[PDB]
Amino acid sequence: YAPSALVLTVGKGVSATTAAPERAVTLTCAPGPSGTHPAAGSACADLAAVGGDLNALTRGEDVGCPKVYDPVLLTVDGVWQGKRVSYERVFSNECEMNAHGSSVFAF
Amino acid sequence: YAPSALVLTVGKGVSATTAAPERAVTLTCAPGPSGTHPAAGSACADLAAVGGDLNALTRGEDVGCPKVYDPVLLTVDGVWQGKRVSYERVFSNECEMNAHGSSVFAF
Amino acid sequence: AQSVPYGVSQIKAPALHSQGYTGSNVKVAVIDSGIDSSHPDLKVAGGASMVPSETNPFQDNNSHGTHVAGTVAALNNSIGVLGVAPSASLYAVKVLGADGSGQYSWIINGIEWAIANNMDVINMSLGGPSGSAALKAAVDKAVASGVVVVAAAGNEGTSGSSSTVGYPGKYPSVIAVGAVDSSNQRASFSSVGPELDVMAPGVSIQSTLPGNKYGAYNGTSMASPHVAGAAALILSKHPNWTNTQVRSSLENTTTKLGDSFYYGKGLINVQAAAQ
Amino acid sequence: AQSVPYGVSQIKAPALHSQGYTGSNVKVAVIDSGIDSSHPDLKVAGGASMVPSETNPFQDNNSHGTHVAGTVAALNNSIGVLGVAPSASLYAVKVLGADGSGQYSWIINGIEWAIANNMDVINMSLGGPSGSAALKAAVDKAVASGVVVVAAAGNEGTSGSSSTVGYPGKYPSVIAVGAVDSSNQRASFSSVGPELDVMAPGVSIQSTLPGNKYGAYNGTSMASPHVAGAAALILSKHPNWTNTQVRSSLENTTTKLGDSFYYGKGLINVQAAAQ
Ligand SMILES: [Ca+2]
Ligand SMILES: [Ca+2]
Ligand SMILES: [Ca+2]
Ligand SMILES: [Ca+2]
């Protein structure tokens, strides 16, 4: 009985709010993958892979983004293995962030 | 384009964590109601009613709970009208909390 | 072996039980979630259910109600615990569901069952923050009827200098019980305000649970059946004392603790009440 | 009217344009997201796409690439802005999708198109944090080939005393551009480390956007086409100078700013470069 539920936001800005959220989704891997995630099954799969640890999501390796600075802020809140979560990160642009996990940020 | 997504947890305890989450759901009213909520449509309807403001959820009026003290902690995180959220409350027991909104806490 | 929860002791019950007063021939209605009638440390005379979808008074799906019932009459043998009023006739008026939730009109209806079936004492370890004309009318008629009425103060600790006493215990016609520890310290969650009558042991009160189990709980809920069992012993000593006499007795012989917004009159002492 | 972005000025471009050096007859390939060829302040010679699902080099669905292209050759008329090298032949090597994301092998492939089609200068305002044997081989062959190679330092500001310069600009064969403001202050997001060559204006750099629009942007990305347009003018003055000569020229005539982990050699000065 995996207590699992996340919500994800993203807006231009360098901090939580002094940076509105322009997109927001929810993911749930428990028991099976669902939520508003145009890529649930992979994300679960992602976190599973890294076993729920944002901070450990191999960036890209062979993907390049435009070197523009339009900072984007990523928030994640919920539980994983009934373990709480409250992560937030800032990527220099939106391509960076997308090259970040594989599918977590498939958003 | 209502940026809307919440996640809800609940565990015995007086604080966020030094109180595991034993149950967790996600709700989404935007555009329409969905999520893991054995009562989505009402909750949306609830928040809509109160227009997303936890702190304003008429308790009961004509429902009584057992006067046992088994404190339960409620967390809510997300966005409402693309407005962020980070609410958490402690009810003296679990009946209290259920008598709280109508359906938000329909959990 | 059998053990005596500290609470039965805090209140001087055994002194009475020593002199032959065990609550015998007295009818106590526990309005609540029902009562496991199949536990060995309990003996349930009868009862009824106001819960439409949960109609066996003797099936406590919450455990709550069983816990409470045990603080009033846990039998007096060589097993389990010991109720305050061990030979008391126990009635299960169920008005609380499995979730411990019950409509006011169920509560109300339960009170009415008890008046008609001539209970002497009623225990209501339930409460909500708003009251109503019917509920108030309900407990008011019990008292006119001669029933002693007891109920939990509430678990909302303090809140300014405002009262946190819920209903029906806010109503002046109901004895409202707050909770203290083995040290006579009020438990923190205990409701305060001027509608509080007395205090009783309500922190880690060990009683009976559904399925031949025993366990410990906390709450103003656990304090009430102390006062309820209390009322009951006094009537085994003095069976034609009015409820007024019994009430009056309980509140005039308390050991005074703190200031009355936090402690009312203080910890009851039935030994001292029975005179 | 036409306006001259401060950046074209920071770097002394107009001095050259005054003496007849406008980057004319020089082939600059902008490897990127493509370039709106239908904007009035741009004139696009030709180009190709390595993006399999996005095969028109002249359709910039990101705008990025259009912005950059404009910092190199925005035409010189009575409208819009002004490129650094206004008469430069512009090529759109698209290797970035609508999302501004492109595989290394697309980048690589784009470089290869440019070598074969004899570009003189290549601008790569793209980058990732890890490199590879092929990518490195890629820029290395450009240079052997005689192409001047320029690329954004990266936008990861600082991080200990570790380098935050991404690829391909980390590679010593690529000129790597960091970014300064109108005050020659390095922008904060600007990457640092020993692989940084020079700085250029990369904060609120106003250029052309898809749909006859003009707007301002920030990034090491905006700094590169400054150096790229730079390279280009020097070749309009000296068309049979090797890339080595041109590189060497740019880095030996910089105005020195801070310490080189943060500024490399300093702000380029093409006026001073063309001799
Ligand atoms: Ca016993
Ligand atoms: Ca009262
Ligand atoms: Ca122009
Ligand atoms: Ca370099």
Inter-residue contact D145 to D244 (CB < 8 Å):
no
CA C172 / ligand 2 centre spacing (Å): 4
Inter-residue contact D219 to D179 (CB < 8 Å):
yes
CA D70 / ligand 3 centre spacing (Å): 9
Domain extent, residue D93, equals 1-275
Task: Give catalytic status of residue D32 as yes or no.
Answer: yes
Inter-residue contact A77 to A86 (CB < 8 Å):
yes
Please give the distance of CA A53 from its chain centroid, rounded to a whole number. Answer: 11
Cα separation, C85 vs D24, in Å, equals 107
Question: Is C169 annotated as a binding-site member?
Answer: yes
Q: Residue A35 forms beta bridges with which residues? A: A27
Task: Give the ligand at the shortest distance from the Cα of C131.
Answer: 2
Residue carrying the six token digits 């990518």: D135
- How would you class C249 by CB atoms within 10 Å of its CB: exposed for 0-12, middle for 13-18, buried for 19 or more? buried
- Min CA distance, B59 vs chain C (Å)? 8
CB interface of B with C, residues 22-81, below 8 Å: 59-71
CB interface of B with A, residues 1-30, below 8 Å: 3-9, 16-17, 20-26, 28
Which residues, 6 or more positions from B91, have their beta carbon under 8 angstroms from its beta carbon?
A: B71, B72, B74, B97, B100
Nearest to D6 by CA among D85, D65, D81, D72: D81
Inter-residue contact C186 to C263 (CB < 8 Å):
yes
Task: Give the ligand at the shortest distance from the Cα of D81.
Answer: 3
Interface test with A, best of B1, B6, B7 (most A CBs within 10 A): B7
- How would you class D176 by CB atoms within 10 Å of its CB: exposed for 0-12, middle for 13-18, buried for 19 or more? buried
Task: Find the radius of gyration of the CA atoms of chain A.
Answer: 13
Cα separation, D220 vs D190, in Å, equals 6
Residue carrying the six token digits 């890629």: D138
E strands, chain C, are 27-32, 44-49, 89-94, 102-103, 121-124, 126-127, 148-152, 175-180, 198-201, 205-209, 213-217
Cα separation, C90 vs C112, in Å, equals 16
Let me know if chains B and D touch, i.e. at least 3 Cβ pairs under 8 angstroms. no
Contact D100 A63 (CB under 8 A): no
The three-class DSSP label of residue A40 is: helix
Residue in A closest to D165 by C-alpha: A67
Residue in A closest to B17 by C-alpha: A84
- Min CA distance, A30 vs chain D (Å)? 31
Residue in D closest to A94 by C-alpha: D99
Domain extent, residue B28, equals 1-107
Q: Residue C164 forms beta bridges with which residues? A: none
What sign does the CA torsion over B49, B54, B56, B62 have? Answer: positive
What sign does the CA torsion over C68, C71, C77, C81 have? Answer: positive
Which residues of chain A have a CB within 8 Å of the CB of D128?
A: 59-65, 99
Which residues of chain A have a CB within 8 Å of the CB of B86?
A: 77
Instruction: Look at phi and psi of residue D140 and say left if phi exceeds 0, alpha if psi is from -120 to 50, else beta.
Output: alpha
DSSP collapsed to 3 states, C100-120: CCEEHHHHHHHHHHHHHCCCC
- Min CA distance, D186 vs chain A (Å)? 14
Cα separation, D107 vs A66, in Å, equals 12
- Method of determination is X-ray
| Number of compact structural domains in chain A | 1
What sign does the CA torsion over D93, D99, D100, D104 have? Answer: negative
Q: Return the partners of chain C (3 or more C-beta pairs < 8 Å).
A: B
Cα separation, B27 vs D274, in Å, equals 64
Helices (H), B1-107: 40-50, 94-98
* Resolution of the experimental structure, in angstroms: 2.2
For the CA atoms of D81, D82, D86, D90, what is the dihedral angle to 10 degrees?
A: -50
C102 touches chain B (CB under 8 A): yes
Inter-residue contact D177 to D150 (CB < 8 Å):
yes
Q: What is the CATH number of the domain that holds D52?
A: 3.40.50.200
Contact B98 C220 (CB under 8 A): no
Inter-residue contact B89 to B74 (CB < 8 Å):
yes
CA C215 / ligand 4 centre spacing (Å): 73
Inter-residue contact D155 to A67 (CB < 8 Å):
yes
Inter-residue contact C68 to C123 (CB < 8 Å):
yes
Which residues of chain B have a CB within 8 Å of the CB of C31?
A: none
Nearest to D268 by CA among D190, D173, D201, D171: D201
Nearest to D93 by CA among D228, D195, D185, D194: D228
Task: Find the radius of gyration of the CA atoms of chain C.
Answer: 16
Let me know if chains C and B touch, i.e. at least 3 Cβ pairs under 8 angstroms. yes
A45 touches chain B (CB under 8 A): no
Contact D126 A62 (CB under 8 A): no
Which residues of chain B have a CB within 8 Å of the CB of A82?
A: 20-22, 24
Task: Find the radius of gyration of the CA atoms of chain B.
Answer: 13
Residue in D closest to A92 by C-alpha: D155
CA D40 / ligand 3 centre spacing (Å): 8
Would you say how long chain C is, in residues? 275
Q: What is the CATH number of the domain that holds B27?
A: 3.30.350.10
CA distances from D86 to B22, B38, D7, D78 (A): 66, 64, 14, 13
Contacts across the A-B interface (CB distance below 8 Å): 80
| Number of C-beta neighbours around residue D18 at 10 A | 9
Query: Please, what is the angle between helix D224-237 and helix D64-73, to 10°?
Result: 30
| Number of C-beta neighbours around residue A31 at 10 A | 9
| Number of compact structural domains in chain C | 1
